[PDB]
Automatic annotation (TrEMBL):
It comes from Deinococcus radiodurans (strain ATCC 13939 / DSM 20539 / JCM 16871 / CCUG 27074 / LMG 4051 / NBRC 15346 / NCIMB 9279 / VKM B-1422 / R1). This is Alpha-amlyase. The lineage of its organism: Bacteria, Thermotogati, Deinococcota, Deinococci, Deinococcales. GO terms for biological process: carbohydrate metabolic process. InterPro entries: Amylosucrase, Amylosucrase_C, GH, GH13_cat_dom, Glyco_hydro_b, O16G_dom_2. Pfam families: Alpha-amylase, Amylosucrase_C-like. One of its GO terms (molecular function) is amylosucrase activity. SMART domains: Aamy.
Amino acid sequence: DDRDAETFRLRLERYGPELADNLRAVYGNHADALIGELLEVMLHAYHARPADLKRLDEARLLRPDWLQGPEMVGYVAYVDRFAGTLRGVGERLEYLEGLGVTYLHLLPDDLSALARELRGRGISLVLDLVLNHVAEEHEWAVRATAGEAAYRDYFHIFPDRTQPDAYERTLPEIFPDFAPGNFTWGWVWTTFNRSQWDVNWGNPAVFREYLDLILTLANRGVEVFRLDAIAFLWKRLGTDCQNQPEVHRLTHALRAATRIVAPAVAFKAEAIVAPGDLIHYLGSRDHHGRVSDMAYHNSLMVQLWSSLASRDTRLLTAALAAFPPKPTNTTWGVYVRCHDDIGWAIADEDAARVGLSGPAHRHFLSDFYSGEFPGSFARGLVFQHHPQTGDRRISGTAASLAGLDLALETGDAERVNDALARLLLLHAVMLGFGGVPLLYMGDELALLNDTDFAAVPAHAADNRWVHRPQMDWELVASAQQPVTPAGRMFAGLRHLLAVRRRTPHLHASTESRPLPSPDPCVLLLRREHPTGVLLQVYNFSEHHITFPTWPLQEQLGAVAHDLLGESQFHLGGPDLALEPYRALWLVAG
């Protein structure tokens, strides 16, 4: 067609110069020869792209903020732990749609079909894609061990280790006087496992290969790519070989190319680093909003559990205030739990600003969520003990960490009520923060720890399987005036989701900003959306607070309307009561 060729030409006149500039920046004179190749790869991908996905492309060019609407609800789940295979996932879609899920992150023909059904139900397929490394059994590695100098340059090989221990000087090692480093026998760069060979992004061929991979995967129906291990993909002598600027230039290139071939897809950078480093993944300088679309808001999560544990929200507001503003076209992925463990990412400066320490607060969080603290409701486990810092990762479901696990074995209805209120609180903060909320599978049923995880020998070692349970669809069907804990959690969350979908204020474009509070137990989050100021109030304690109305008064006026409880109260009277773990979404009433 002439229309398709013209469309492609227009997109290339748009995003082309971005793409060319970044490639010439990191490949120099090798850029031209690569550009000509990528042109062919893009053209092949573009003309092979199904018509319905082209319609999706056009649609997403009409709505570039599709990830930002308050209607977006995420759902992260292992494929086998959810429905065995992809076909079963296809068989369990009325449930997801019943929740309101539009963003389905599936953790690692059939896939194409599943994507088709998903789009049919208005759900975006989200897949992991590792950008840093491939297995040793992968084609490139096998071809490399065959002696082909072409496929050996896809990696980092070395004759004598005069170069390995040259990098190892600036490379962070888990232990000093030892050597569980980042190399494997020539000498092959292996930052993670012994069988995970790192790819050489200094070679244009691997860029081309990865772009082709992204595009064909996009043509299968994948709408959002979680770029796994994106921080390590560039390596430079004399550095930690992490978070290098070349990473963001390469990401910008990939992104532009994809914005030409497939406008409908988006990137979600998987990078669990400090905020100062993380903000670059949403693009700084010339990369501003021109790289990955999403990034994880890990800080909000660790601060959620932190504040829930300490009943004090000073550190949370502190850490949020020192958090850099994102480009308005990018969207945080927000969450309460996930497949991974919990690393207490707390800045010593953040703690210092609120008159705390840091290492002792990390010690606090670990002691609490492992169950060693007097008056702790947490029923979590210890995943790993950090070698010299002494930090501890914590495994456990949202429900067990929030106190329901302990509540049930000790049939105290008060403890149960409190636990459910805590969980609904956390989920309420997430759903009203701004960004696609990533419901971890099972949390809507308040799933408890799967302590029989050791029954599977493969899961026996890694105790993170205590919070990676198999989906019991009978439990699901039953939980679906609730009396069952799972039913009550399901109901509460359904309500929260409805209220979110309504509220236009929660558009991800506008960021939640922390407001100072008279009461440490109360968290105030201001969202200044064009339609009105949305003031969120949260009681992070089990106390019945008598809160002053003035902080609300000078924000919303004399009358306030609660979106969550459909209530409407006056802000003149000096005080109002906050019941344990109450959550308010206030607007001008």
